[model samples]
Structures are given as structure tokens and as C-alpha cells.
Target: AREFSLEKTRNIGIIAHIDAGKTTTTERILYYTGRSAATTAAWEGHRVNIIDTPGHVDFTVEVERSLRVLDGAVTVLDAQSGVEPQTETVWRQATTYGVPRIVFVNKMDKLGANFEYSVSTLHDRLQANAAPIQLPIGAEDEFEAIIDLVEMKCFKYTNDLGTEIEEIEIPEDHLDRAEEARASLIEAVAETSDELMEKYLGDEEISVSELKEAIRQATTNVEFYPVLCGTAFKNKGVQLMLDAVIDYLPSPLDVKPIIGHRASNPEEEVIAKADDSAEFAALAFKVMTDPYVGKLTFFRVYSGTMTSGSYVKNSTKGKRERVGRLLQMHANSRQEIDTVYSGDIAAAVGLKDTGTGDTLCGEKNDIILESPEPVIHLSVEPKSKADQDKMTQALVKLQEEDPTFHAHTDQVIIGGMGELHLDILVDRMKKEFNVECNVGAPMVSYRETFKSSAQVQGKFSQYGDVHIEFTPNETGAGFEFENAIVGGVVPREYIPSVEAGLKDAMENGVLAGYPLIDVKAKLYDGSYHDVDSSEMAFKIAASLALKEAAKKCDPVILEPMMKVTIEMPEEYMGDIMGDVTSRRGRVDGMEPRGNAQVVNAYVPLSEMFGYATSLRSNTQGRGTYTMYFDHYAEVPKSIAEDIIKKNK
Candidate 1:
């Protein structure tokens, strides 16, 4: 049962490249949604509930987290630039969560603006089923009118910014393009409904009501993307985009149940619906540690209602937390609210032990939604001990506010898709968190592995009667262990102790100190003094056994490889490709994206430390790239020795 109707709720997030006008676009949407007054409909205004995420690479974690809480998204793209590398990263994230998207091709008033090129890129590169609903009246400064396909009418703007629009007949200059784009849209709508097809085929005219219904189906199904052209900065064609969001973008109720885990029985699936009356369920998507109130958890109510002074169980932590206050966030500003309804986004103060990705609900259903496991391979050190002391608290607060922000000992690893990403993170830490840190250029953390089978014996006889055997496991098999001891040869109770010892040895690694991988160690044969054999004795024996086995296996260091995508102008393609090859990067493929070329490759993360800076210099800052961890491969003998030495 639902406590409130989801029909009144909307769950959407704004996505776009840096300076692609997403913030401006969001301001317009919020104004139209009545969340803010028109006077405050400016990017810098502090009035509406919007998450204005940074588009810099370092903030990729922010993008990833926001996508998790959003039911739908509006991906703003530069009309002329089309899809960039970071756009694909965000696109992949949306696909990961199965969130439907609305593509807003912004900046139509700019020179070289090609609305068709942008839509075609989405279709060709992303393989998105795209439908154009609004057609521009003109390009460049003359851009003044928008053709609405669904309404089959024109909205003409007399002034720039499009704060006011008047319904007008489609101008003669835009008629040809308008008809062409409308035809394409109708064809896309036809695929979704037979009735739409019949009407479209019979008179080549789609009724406004029929078109909206058909478009809604395609949008909800994620089968076809509805493209709207506009210049958010100029405010052209923005209101139409806002209207499209409410009409086509999904509400919480439209989305399927959220699948999470039950704390008591981890194996069982706990489904969280969007029904307000259902047992309350929400994920503390973000935890902002405030200086005044301490920890504030920003959550999206997936189901049921929550209000100020209410109490809910922190299902993940098995603790009861009171909602001291409910706040609607407008950027960094918090407005106190009496209650937060289902499908609404709000933050609660005093969620002491709770953090990001934590599921909160009624006591009856204790559920857990763990944030995506983060991998920390890169390390950073604060510039001074004073800064070092600040590291722990700073990172704690950072990670709380941004779940993707990660830091660990040994290596203060901050993960990002690329170098620019790390740079942004480091800058934010220094500027926002007041921590000074000098990080080495970002490097990808890798692992180690062995090839072929070799026998080795580990002996802790000096310490005690401890021995172990090591053998190679299949490549990418990860890790496994076994006991070859038969009968009471190795006491059953001591077996665990022996394995523990083996594990310690493996984790620390004997080769260059880069922990071993894909190699299995076995305590097949060992002699122990029954009276003197203790867990410690067996542990030493196992450690020795692993060393002995590993010596025969011949371990090798493995380097992390990333699947990289680079977008550059046609003129710089050759230079960029050459630079990639010089870094031992393999060009997996290449395709034409709008006016540029996109190259996909698998490159060693180590070789990419300064890639972003170099690429910007090489291409006059016209080329950009994004990458994600793909897998690991053995480090070449030449590089392996150096890696081993550095690790040691």
C-alpha cells in the first residue's frame, strides 16, 4: 500500500557537460515547476531545490551518486559539440541504473549549432532511439522561435532569454526543417503505437494528444529519446523542455520497485516500491557533515512519507534515528520543511551513525543498500603534518557528503575516471575542506600474478614445525585455497590457522611486495608436533609453505588497464592517436562524433598520469577524454622491476 499518490511526485536529475548550460536549464525547469519564483530563475540564485554538480572530472563520483537517486535525467549537450567523452561516462552511469533520459541540445543560438548532428550522434554513437519534439526557427542570433511537434504549434520569442513566449504560426524559414524533424518524430512515435501509426500513415498528421501519449510510452520505455533544442543561457526553448520533463520524464510511481537486500537474510531481495502508504523506505543518498548540526543525511523517499519529529530505523546500521528536521536543499542552502512526502527529496538532521547509500525504513523491514563498492588505488599525502592531522576528518566529511569520495591509508587513494578528475578532487579538498595536500600525478593502482605452475615450500621450522605448498591458479581466477592434508595429518582445527598464515603471506607478497594473485597455496603435506602445534605454530608453517611454493611459481607484477575514450577535432586525431601509441595504449576502435573523432583504447593507468594536461596542450584544449578501470595485465619485465622497487 502507498501512503501518497506518486502522480504528484517527480524524480529527475540534470546532467550536462561543463558550461553546456545544465545549471541554467535546471533553473528554468525549477521555475516552471513552481519550486522557485521566476525572478530567482538564475544560475547563481539560492531559491530552488537543485543539485548543481560540478562537471569537472574529479566530481565524477558526484555524478554517479546523483544518478542513483534519480528516476529520470535530462542530459544537456552542446548543440555544436554534440557528445563529448564525459557525456558518455554519464550516459553509461544512467544506463547502469536504467534511468530514462531527456536530451536537451542546448546553445542553439551559438555559431555552428547543428541540432540534427547532435541528435544523430546520440542515435549513432549511443545507439539511442532519438525523437526530436522541438525544432528551432533559426540558427545563430536569429534563433527566435520553436516548433512544438506534439502541439503542432510555434512559440515565438520577441526578446532574448525567452522569458516570455507568444504562440505563433511556424515561420516560412523554419517550415522545411520543422516538417523534416516532425516527420522523423512521428515515425519514432509510430513504432510505439499502432494507432499512432495508422493516423500518421493516413493523413501524415499526428494529433497533439495522440503524439504526447505515444512519446510518453517511448520515453518511459527508454526506447526513444525526445530531443529538445534550446539555448538555456539565452532561455530559448527552455519552457518547452521543462514541460517535456513533467510530461515525458518518469515519476517515482512510474518506476519499478527498487531491489535491495534484507539485513536479517542477506540472500532475500527486499523490494521498495514508490507507494507512499507502503512501509517507509528511503536511501540516505548523501551525508553532508555540517559544522553546525554535525551529520545531515540527504535521502530520496522511494516509498511512504516521512516528516519532522518522526523516527525511522537505519536499516543498514540496525539503529533508530530521529528526524530532527527535514530540509529541502537548494544547492548548499537548507530550507526547513514540515514533512517530506514519498518521491520527494529531502535531508534529515542528526543521522548520527548513518551515511551515504544507507537504507532507512520502518522497523518492520530492515533493508540495506550499499553504495557501489569503491576501489582505491591512487594515494595522496597532505603537504604537512598539520594538514595530515586534518586529513582524517576532512576525508571523513568529504566521503560522508560524497559517497564516491574515498581515502585509505598506505595510499591516500582518491578515485576518478582520469587525471583531471583527481586534480579537481585535490583542489576541492584544499579549497573546500581546508586541507593542503600535494599529490603525485594520479596513477592507476595495479596488482600481481604468476604464469605456469611451479612448486615451492614455505618453512617456519626455525620458528616451529610450519610448512606450506604453493601452486599457480588460472589467470583471472582471483583467489582460492585448499588443504591437501588427509586424515589427521594436519589437525582440522589448525587448518584455519594455516590458511590465515597463507593469506597474510599472499597479501604482503614475496615478489616486489605487490601481493600475489591467481596462485593457490596448499598445505598438502606438513609435520607438526601435536603437543607444541598451536595456531601460531600452524600459521608460521603455512606462511613458510606459501613462500616455498611461490618461489617456484615466479610471480610477476600486474598493471591496471583502463578503457579510455578520447574526443578530439579531426585535425588533431593523428597527433592524439600517436600520443596514445607512444604510451603503449592500444587503439581498440575509432568513430566520427559530430565534427570530431572519438578514439577508444585500453591503456595502462600508469601511462595516463599526465594525459589530460598533455592532451589539452596538444589539442589547444579542444580534446577531452574519460576512462574507467577495465582490468589488469602483467607488467612488462622492464616496468615490473621498477614497480616492485617503488612498492617496497
Candidate 2:
């Protein structure tokens, strides 16, 4: 038997927007209990392994890789603001990976805190089926105890720090609300099981474990997030939150088998189950160079076991490396362990060939994990010539560990997710590498697209007629190059050449040299030359035709707009709202965040430059904001002319 049962191990991650107390939540989880540099801890009878997620101080790594390795994630939200923009963006990333999640509402003791308001946003804002399993005894400064809705019990902390606690009955004042909440909880759980439904309907008694199991079933299935609230800073309700992690979050064995492809043939399906005897397969999610450890390749063992000195293949790239040393890592303390089995995450000493997203597995038992692409662009440049030589190598090192991060040293642009993502890399580069850097908007990549259809012909240097029909595609549909050539009018060989040419022009856009997207170009009719025609001729003909067609259709500029959510005290509302308008922003709506106000707007990213400094000045350091790339809006003709003229 293994030292830790596979069914009892929970490999989990914490993903939160900055300032949501995600860092504090991690310190507490490992406080009682935790590791992926996982601080592994024993809570009750389970081994809870917490993955060290990015955006937490020094960890400064990617949640993308963390979410990929973990079976479940806990998404922390600000109690006042509900689902903030960055939280939604990161939460959406978790959902993209299909990781089951539970929601933790931080700042419950803060002035603007609202439990039901936060829970409702999980439902309305994030579109999650939220189930509140615990209710706070009081809010703001009065925040004292957390009442368990499912157990029909209350935990009144004997002291604010929760060093001592008493399990008490629900107080009379809160008993009715508690009962009603419990009734809703029962109905939701009962929906997951017929026997429980019968018990509830017939008034037959149901055991506590029966109800717990039903919630666990729905939770692991991601049917509903088991919502729990507590201020991580206050140390209240955190233990119970840990209890929920064990009770509700899926075990390594609970999730479906980690799917991959046969390394030899990608078309063949491979499923790696959580079993020690199964062939070893681990996905290298992070690659960092430790000051002492040289290169640390952090990977999660999906199946089987690896011993020190064992040779394994880097399944993704077909490179083989010998197992060097197994490190049982903790942010505070570190130890070397000789072996790691199924459900374990280890930061190994070697495996230089295994970069981020590379799958390392036993020879002949190969697998590869497909990866995601980077979005949300930015441009970075080293501020000091003294640090210039050092910047590229340092960024290259970071790019190795950060799979979602993109660095174009040639263009001198380093872009990743939210401002936080860049700041994290900034954190590492400044502290870890001692480099001062300047970052800015990766200039709004405005797009060029036609609203109407236009047909045109072109005969280039190599004689060929390309009758290209260009039309608009659905927004975000991207370049849709089609082959509608009938009766072999356009030679089959030349169709792809026509497409490549259109794609090239799409990148080198017509207006202001920005890229063209959301376009539908079809090679409907064309003639090929026998001696005079080549792929190059069709290529030029397509490019020439596209340039001609650009003016005929209703060409427009699409500028990126950001969804900004600003939370400020009521007194500063007028200035903040007024400032938003001055920036050419559209305030969508406003809502009450307890004693504060939340103003929602869609402002052009170009207009948000220096917003942080301006916001702090207007609100006297109390106002805060979070924004994400929302959508592209068509620029008005007046603004369009100014931008078009800027091309001069």
C-alpha cells in the first residue's frame, strides 16, 4: 500500500485576482495543513497538496499551468466587489481547463462586505450555479462566527484570531434564516440523488454524511460551487474552508483519466489513470532556474512512480533524461525525496530537456499534453542600458517557465495576461534578475475588416486572373479563406497560394498597417498560366486583388475596448463618473457595494493610460479598479479620421 492513499489526496490550486487575499488564503491553508512546491499537510485523514499558483508574491508563476495540474481550484473573490474583472478572466481560464472550483469570499470583515451580494454574483456575474454552505454570523467589524447551513450548527470563534473556538447551536436570532438556508441546501443536494429526494419529500430522516456526499458529488461534478466566506486575514472560517476542500474537492482519482495521445502517433488516444503501478507520466508545467538547484522542472505525476536515477523520455519532444534528484519542495522549507508516485507533484533537479508543457513519462509509455496560446499583449523594454545585455536572457528564462507568456525580443515586446501577469514577470526580473523595465500598452491592435462584399480581378507579373470575392465574417470569426472555385477555373494548386497571400496581407493590414481580421475571402474564380504562371504568380495576383478590394467594401477600424469595474467610496462617485466620461468611456451601470459604489464602464484601452495615478488622485487613494479586454468596438467616423491621419 502507498504511504498516502490516492483516493485521499487532493491536488488543488488557488486562483484569484490581485488584492483578493489569495496570498493570505494560501498561507493559512498551509498553516493548518498543504504542496505542488506543495506544502503537503495532513488534515483529518487526507493529504491535501496545494499547488503554488502564480500572482502570489515571490511565486510569480502561471495559474494556467497550475490549473492544468490540479484536480480542483478555489477561486477567491472580494466580498464587496463580487466577481471582479480579473477574477472573471482567471476564473474563465480555470473553466477552460475544466477544473472544478469552490468560491472563497475574502474581506468579509471589511466595511463594504456583503455575503449574499458576492454569492449572487457567482450566479449572475460568473454564471455559476452557486450553493452557499456557510453563512457569516456578522459582517464588517461585527464579523464573529460562521454558521454551517448544512450541519445546522454554528462556529463562534472564542477569539478573533480563532486560536480557540466553540461549537455552538445556531443562535435564536439567526435560527430561522439558518433553517431556511439549510432547507435550500437540502433541496439542491436532494436533486443530485433520488433517495435523498424521497427522504426529503416523505419527511424521512437523512443522515449527515448522506447530505454531505450529495454536495460532494455535485461539487466535484462542478454542478455548483460550494460557497464559503471568511476573512483569511482574521483566521476565521478558514479551517472549515480547508474541511470543504477535503469534503468537496475531487481527489486525484476522482477526476477523469488525464487524457493524452500516443507519442508515436498523436491520433491514437491515451488515458493515464491514477495508479502507482501504471507507467509513469508527468506533465512538466513549470521550468525555473533555482539559485542553488540549477534548473528545477516542476511536474505533476499523473500516474505510476519515478525513482532517483531512472531514465525517462521527454514525451513531448522525444528527448530522454535521467531522473536526477526528487525534491519535496516548500516555500519555507525544502527536502530531497528519492521517489514520487501517482497523485504527487515534485520539483525535480534535472530533466533540462523538459520545458513547460513537455510530458515526461516512462520509455514506451509516452504522452504529450497540448497547450494554450497567449493573449492580452504588452510591450516591455529595459529602462537602463546597464541592464540591456541582461534583460533578454532573464526574460528568456522566465518564458521557459511561463508557457502562456510571449517574448519577442526582436520586437522588444513581452506580453502576457492581466497587468498582474506582466507585474509578476516584472517582480522576477526586478528581484530575481535585478533589471529595471518599462512596460506599456502593446498599442491597440486595431483590425481592418469589410462590412460589404466586393469582387475584383488582378493579373500580376506572372499572368493569372484572380477574381477574389471578399466579404465580412462574424466578429472574432477571424480570417475565413474559402475555396469556392467552380469548374477548375482556378487551378487547385493555386488556391492555397491564394489563401497564403490573403493571410499575409491580413497580417500586413491596409489601414494604418494594423492587422486585418474577421474577414471572409474566397478564391471563387481565377485562371492559371501554363508557362508564365507559378505559385508566386497566384500569390501576387491574390495580394494585388485583395489590395484593390479593400477600398470597395465598407472598410472600418475596430478598436479594443476594456470592461472596467471601478469601486469607490460614495463621496468620490461624481469625480470618478465624470472622469470616466471625459475619457470617452461609456458607463454601463452603477451598483451599491455596501457603503461604496461600483461604476461599470467600457473604455478604450488607449484612454486608460495613467488611469491608476489619476484614479488615486480623484478618490484620495480609496478608489480601486480592475479591467479586462472586453470586445472590439467600431470607431466612429470622426475618431477614425484622426487615427487614419496618424498613419502619415
Candidate 3:
């Protein structure tokens, strides 16, 4: 019943840091895969499903979630500067999900491109088992040929556009280096296979097929990362890279079964395999709002086959939706398809209730993929009454499309991954949704929580009285509600009302109006009146009790902390380090990264506003930095007092 065999499918992602040629590499990949233009044919009679992920830290969720669905990935690195801060971020994310990956050192045509330095950084920074599978024949502007270590051939780009590749014998001048690199590669592959290791130890001749098969196994297990080098912008070595992808990267069948849970029984775990006989299971990873089309839900089919007009239950929401149309995606364009098979990525229409990270399953199969937390908040309002209604609709559609973008309240307080993220969304509203709006300055999304345990009683005009105890939970533990009242102290029906009220009260902290987090509430004792007591009464009592308990529980303000990295010329290191120290930053270390020096530090998010301008001015417009939310730390008493006073 299988429409396409698993080995014929390759689900891979292309990822890298900003300005590292990731987008260009994706363009090249699409061209070579026969999806963009007629430069090269698809390899080995297999279909490669490639997803291009963003490199900016603000769009880190795009890379994180994409890795979740990819069976393998290709991480692009800049030849001049390797292992950047955002690079480390994505590397950790890929490893977190156990995604096997290979490295592509790009920009070899640049003046400072260093293949050895790039490989060294992978070993030193990423701690990866790196071995070169392809080497550049020449350095810098003279770069033209790539020595294929596995096949022992010279692949020279003859055309000025680098479209025509000519295979020739390894040049005599590069013979020694090529043999040395190939020997090192064989040793690296031999360590992963017992039979290969025995043959290598006995000094037996190992065929190229045997070495490739061993490398494929090692790469699948993530034990070896086959590093390939090329100038993607110049279009050299891309065809060989595509061949390496087919040789080493895993197919959908090589990945483990998709683990999830039954919709009816949350505690019971289930798994959906990559076979047609299994139930249909797919994850909605992205939602796009196209002007020509309504809303396109892009999903990765994990198991079975899904056809247009078929009904699939959204196990994440316990709702059913009909798939109106199915289409295969090529970047922004799509081609309509009647059926999509497992291990394929496609776009679907008419899924009314689906959102990012939601699981769409055949029947009884439910799953929940991880979603990222928003770190920055912005306030916005429509310009006019008509614009206000349109803005509200636009926000609703956008919120459905992006999991990390959140909108709440009539004031329209929006939360996002970063300031630029919100700015883009606001701009999109004006351009795509045809609604103009005014946006406020970005603010840190702070939180409030108790530092100790306390008990308090609430008496709301004699309608109801409730007693509750609040205790502090660990950081990021969120809120927890427990009903410990026995002997009918509190009715079961009214308990939900109490929990809802408590949750609402936690939204506006008593300290500075920030939301409260990491607190546990236990409802132990309460008195109810049959005549005047109602759900509203209990809800009010619960809110009052929470406010009273928080005052006595010694609540504190928690500010977001950011892990920041600054790369600047050596002369500006002193000034940059001094500025960081003045902002109460903790310097982790400094390293010499090629022509520039990189300073790694952790700083409070409150002090980072206008930092880009400051850094550029201090370094003569030559410094660049990237930061991401690290954790939430308690704000100092002096700053907390200022925040509280300003709120008041």
C-alpha cells in the first residue's frame, strides 16, 4: 500500500547563522534538486525534501522546530568565521533532538576563507568528530577545484558560472595532501565499523563502496560529521555536496518511530511508524497566510498517506478537520497534489483548528511537539475604528500562524521572540493585511513569583470565605493548582471556578503588573452558603485570597537574562568589555576568531536596549553581536523599586 518507498525519501534541513550563506545554499540545493531550475538532475532516483531555516536568533524557533521533523540536516558554516553564537544555538537544538547532520564550509571564494580553521572550530567548539570528505584545491581567489577524498578525483568547475563540472585525475601538485586527507578519513570511518576497522588494521584494500557504506552508518549514528567545502555563491562543489547528501544522510526509514500518546488516554504512550499500514500521523509545523490563497498549513507527514478531502482528527485539540487540498511546496510556490505520502512535506488547506506544534492524526493518536517561549512584549493599537476591526482579524490570523507570537487584551499586547520579530509582524500587518497600526517600544516580558509560603483567608462581603496556602515553585515551573480540601469543604464543581480565578489574578502581578509564574496554590478550607454563594462568589474569593497571600509571601520580580556574544576588532575589545561591565554584565571569555575577537557574556535584558547603536558607535560601525534569552533571574532591589514606582 506504500506510495513511495522510505529509502527513496530524504527529509533534510539547511541551517546556519546569519550572513553564513544559508539562504544561498538553499537556493543552490533547490536548483540542484531539479525543483528550482535545470542546472542538475535529482540524485540516485530519490526525492529530497529540503526545508530552509532562518539564521537570525529572533527566528530560532523556526530552526528548532524544523529539526524536530527532519530526519537529517546540513549545517552551513562560514569559512572565514566558524562556530558563531547563533551557530552554537542551532547546534545545541539539533543535538537536543538527536538529528544527524553533516557540515558544509561555505564561502571558499572569499579572501579569508580557511578550511583548516573552520574544521578546527568544529572540533573545539562543537566537540564534533569532524573529518574532511572534500577539500579545496586552492585557497581564496584562486579556488577552483575540489578534491573528492572518497572517490579520489578532482572536480573542477570549468564554466565561469561554475555550472559545468569536469571530473579529472587528482593534480600531481595536490596528490600528497589528497592521500593524507583520505587516509585520515578512512581511519575516522573505520572507528565506527568493526569489520572496517579489522580490514584497516590488516592493511587490506578497502573499496570506495565499503568506505561510503561505513560513513553512511557512522553519520546516521552522529558519530562522524563528514565536512564538505565549497563556495555556494560561486556555485562550485554543490553537485558533489548533493551527492554526499545522498550517500551519507539518512532517509525517513532510518529515523526512529514517532513517539506520542493516545488521545483518550494521556498517560499511555504510543508510536507511529513510517509505514503505510500505520495510522496517519502528521505535525503542523508552520502556518502561512497567503494573499492569493487563504491560509496554508504546512505539515510533515510522519506515517501513512493523506488524501485531499479526507478528515483527520486534531488530537492536540480533540477536534476534527477536513483536508480540502494538498500541495507540494517549492519555497513560496506550490503544486497541487491529490495524495501526500509519509516522509513528505506538503501544504494543506481548510484545516480550521490547526496551529503550529499541533498534531493531526488518523484516530486515537495524539502528540504534542515542543513550542518556544516568547521573550519580548510590545503594545499596539489600530489607527482607526475600521483599522481596529481589521487589525483584530489580522492579529488573530497571525497568532494562529506563529506559535511564538502571542496577542492578548484589547490594548493588544503582543509577545514575540525579539523586537525585530514583532517589528516584522507589525509591518506584515500593514502590507499583507491592509491594516495600519501604531506600535509601542519593546519591553522585557518580566514575571513575578513568591519567595516563601503563606496562608491567607478571603471574605468577600460574607458571600463566601476561602482559605488557601501558596508555595513557591522552581523557576520556570509555571503555575500549579491543587484542591486539598476534603470532607466537602469546597464543592468539586466550584473548584474549577476557583482555579480559573486564581489563574486570572496571577496575570497582573501585585508588584509591577507583570504576570506571575512558578507558584503552587492549594485550596484547603472554605465555607459556602447555599443562598448567596455561587461560582462568581467563589471566583472572587479565590482572587482575593491570592492577592492577600502574595502580599505576605514576599513576591519578587524576575527579569529575563540574555546570553550575548560580541565580535569586534581587537582595538575595540577594551571599550566593548568596559561597556559590558558597566551594564552589570558577566564576561564568560574572549577568543581570537580570525581577524576579530569574540567576547562572550551574559547580561540582563533590561540593559540591552539601544545596544546595537552603542556597539556600532563604540567600534566605528564594525562590531556585531547576537543574543538570546538564557533564563529568568531575580532583579535587584534597587531596579525592582524603580519598576514598581513607575508602574504605580
Candidate 4:
């Protein structure tokens, strides 16, 4: 049964840093929603869904994955931390995905909590247009109630238990600040619609319900964010957060659905919207490695209904997979169901071949997600002898869980996107594997590269046409988008927009979808609609051409190649030489240095994953080696194809 209408369901992601009280906010959200939840006005008791997109965007792959699957999101911020450095990336990612959001100022009850400062930081750093739809009644530890600006009522709480709420008129002590904040909020909401704007200017008046509707409208689109504050620590304002979720965030049907390439015809476009009777289409946003199931691929079903035992195509992989079982997971337990209809999020087992980012659909239709890679390297070792193997074991668990997370052996080095990226891995090891390890500085960084240059012309809804020449850049140098335009082919103002479009397109390559790096995009010619031409249209034209041209570029995944020279005693020669071969490296030469044989070799940086510590045991204490990045080379076809299979 389609128990809830499309408008009744909300798939929202909670974006926050570790200390931003994300755990408190997230746990409380689930606790209350699971208890029974939204609205007498279609804004009251309804179903609210949460996606796992919390913590820092240290690994952008996770953040991108989260945004790709989410219909809308709740951005949690530390009241004191304001907008942390990492949140800018999160906000940018949300913008790239066009995700509408509501900012929740966490820690309002903690010492040093400043709701005004936290809200101002949005305008300061993120440059997000935000308005406080609700204001906290008190500062810091005295924080006890929230004034609903739209309703203009106080959500009164008796004690820290906060399990009960009483609606009352604003107290005399808070009315001044309340009215001031409420006036600014009304002005912002009025700006959302011209009709309301005229009335707001003429009379400075709007009804409570009209203001509620305006808040939802402004917050529903990307233009504005409704800022709300609360401390989940004491369980205050969380209920309002849930109300805002259904009230403001987009539902599955509210936003346009995923745009996909038709499986049979790569040049064509197919739009997948939500409905049970239509063909099934879903995206694997997360892949979990559970000891019991082998692989738990979390899916957000965008169209049609998926049934257990049904056969579907993994269009990204060009293979067939069986939906062995479907599950709806709670925080600690799960329930299995035979059917998951449209707009529902479910987990599937027996999908070993389907990793994160792959699109799963019914036989009649399919879609592909926009490969995935990471490059900063870190050395890891067991803090003690007993934890040695267990430490490595934890990595395989993580790797299968996250396709972009890579682990290599020789001495056991891991690769990720940033220093904070690998820092999490070490802490994650302790959290999951019960193993502690030491780490070292990053050596540094797959990228997809175009094998042949191609010229592409992209026309966006006849508004603007951008012609770009896509060429590969040298190793280590990232994409260089030069506006080589002469005359008025593309105007001066629209040049950057076209470049911005190329940058967004490069975020995921056209082939297997890994980040396309080391390339030059020069726009030499194009057309524009004088009246209709827009910055967004120009940017869209730039992106369309890149993807269309990528087909001709013969894109391939490039792995960092490393050069190593290991000097070990002559006795270990046989084992050491074979080791180079086993690691997909060629032994360049052997030279005599004192009593040892120096073996020179070139190996893939991936093969260098664990080389650091292994040399100690392999050569005992006498063996030593040094390695550094050489250059990026195309992954062997078979290996590259496998990468395409796992991640594309």
C-alpha cells in the first residue's frame, strides 16, 4: 500500500560537524520520529526520513553522495563554532546539487551559545541568505523557551526533561527582541513573492498563516534558508526542527527527479520521477559491509516499486542483480519487507556487485550516477603486536563500505582526500576494530583523464551555446579552463559562468564518473540569446558540452605511479624481485651498493599501500627503501574496467 502520499514523505540529510551536537540532534530526531510524528495543516504529524550525511565533509565523496540522494537537508551548526571551515564545502556541495536547506543552530543551551552570532555567520562565511524563523528566548544556560516568529507563540518548557511543551503568549520581558526579530523575518518572507511584497510595503501587515506559507515557499527553493535554534542536549526545539522538516524541506515530488542517460542510447536523456506504477529506478547512496549479508546497498527509490526477488539491471555496471531482500532499518534493528514503493529508502542484500553510486532500476529502464577516487596517503601500524592483522582487517571492512576509501600493503598505507580524511580512519579503526595505530604525514594523491582532445558545442534550451575544446593537462596540474574566446562568441560576463559549469562537470567525469583532472577547457566560440541568455543558461551549456564531448575523449582512470629503490641484502633478492612483479611493477635494475643489492622499480601508488612496514619483516632490520610519487598513468584496462564495475 502507498500508505503516505508523496507530499507526506520527506527524505532529509543532517549535515553537521562532530562537535556541532550532530549526534544529539540526529539521535533526538530519530527518537521522536520513531515515537510517532506532523500536521493538522499538512504541516503537523507526518513521516520524516533521515539520511546518514552527518559529520564533517573531510571526505567530499561522502558529502557528494549524501547530497546526490537527498531531496533536501538540515544543516546543523555549532552555536559557538559559527560556520566552521569545513562547512563551506558542505554548503557549496549543497549548492551544486541545488539542495534547499534549513540551518539548525545547535548548542543554544550550552555556555557561549550565541544564536545571533551563529545566524550571522551564515551571511558572513557561507553568504547564505538566512532569516531566523524562530528565536531562542534566553541566552546560554538560561535558555528555556523558543519564540515561533511565524506563529508568534512561546513554546514553553517546564524543566530540562523537555518532554512536554505548552504553547503560550510571548512574555513581556522577551517581546521587544521578539517583535524586532519578527519584523525582520516578515520583511524577508515578503520579498519572496511580489504580491505579498506590495502588501507588506503598503501596510506592513500579513496574517500568521500567510507568513507560514511564505516561510515554506522561500525555504522550499534555493534562494533562502530558515534558521532555527535549539539544544538537543536538553531536548528543546527538536520538535520544532521536525516540524520545520516537513514544513519547509522538499518532498520527493516537489523537486525535479534524477536526470539520467537512457541505457540503450547514451546520447539521449531520461527523467525519472516518482510513482509506483512507473518503471523502477533507484540509486545506491551507501554500501554497508555487514558480517551477515555480505553487502548492504542502501537505495533511494525514485520511481516505481521494487519487490524482493525481482530482477533488475545495474545500468552503471551493465550487469544484472537480484534484490534478495529489502529492509527498512531503524537505529539498532531492521524489518524486512517484500515491496518498497516509490519515494521510499530501503536497503538491499545480495547486491555484492552493486556498490555505492550505482543506479539500480527495473529491466525496462535504468540510470547511472554521476566513478569515484581519493589520493592523500597515510602510514598505519598496529600499536601492539596482537592488533597487527586486525588493523588491516578493519580497512577491508571500510573499503567495501566506501568505494573511494583505498588501502594498500607493503607496510600498510591508506589513501583519502585530505589529512583529516585519514585522521578519521585512524580513529575509526579504534572505534570499529578495537585497534590503535600510529600514522605518518601524507605523501599525496586517481583522476580520470581524456586520452584525445575533442571540441564540443553545448546549447542550453536555446538560450546559450558554449563551444569548448577539452584537452588533457600535464600530470599534477589540475584542470585549466581558459576563456580563449575572441570577439563576442561568448560575452565577457558569461565567461566565468561557462567556466563554473566546466568545474562542476569535472567534479565527476563523463567516463565512469571519477573526478576529471589534468585537462584544459578553452572556450573559443559559441552563441547567446541576447534577451533570454542567462548566467545559468551559459553555465548549463558549458556542462552539457563537456559530458557530450567526454565520449570522444576516450577517458580513462589515472593512478599515481611511484618510483622506489629498495636496498636489501643479496639473500632476499628472489623474494623482493617477485614482490615487485606481484605489485604490478617492473624491476628496472639492480646495482651493487656495499654488501647489498639495490633493486630499482616503478610501481603503482596503489601498490604502495602497505610497503612501509612490510619491508621491515621481509628484509628483517637490514632492509630499507624509499619511494615517492612519479606520475599518473592509465590504470591497466582490466584494472580500470574493474574500477568502472565497482564504482561507476
**Each prediction's whole-model lDDT (CA):** 0.71, 0.79, 0.81, 0.77
Ranking by TM-score: 3, 1, 2, 4
Candidate 2 per-residue lDDT, tens place, 572-599, comes to: 8888878888988989999875566878
Candidate 2: deviation at residue 342, Å? 3.6
Candidate 1 lDDT, tens digit per residue, 232-293? 77678777786777778776767666787878878777777866567888887666666887
Q: lDDT tens string, model 4, 165-256?
A: 88988888888888788888777766666777777768666777777777777777777788998888788888888888877888888776
Q: What's the TM-score of every candidate structure? A: 0.84, 0.70, 0.89, 0.64
Misplaced by over 4 Å in model 3 are 1-3, 35-41, 82-85, 161-164, 263-269, 330-334, 371-373, 484-497, 563-581, 585-602, 615-625
- For candidate 2, the TM-score is 0.70
RMSD of 3: 3.5
- In candidate 4, stretches whose alpha carbon ends up further than 4 angstroms from where it belongs are 36-44, 371-399, 405-648
Q: What local lDDT does model 4 show for residue 524? A: 93
Go through the candidates in order and give the C-alpha RMSD of each one to the true structure: 4.6, 6.4, 3.5, 19.2
Which structure among the candidates has the greatest lDDT?
3
Give the distance in Å from residue 200's predicted Cα in candidate 1 to where it truly belongs. Answer: 1.7
Could you tell me the lDDT of residue 522 within candidate 1?
A: 59
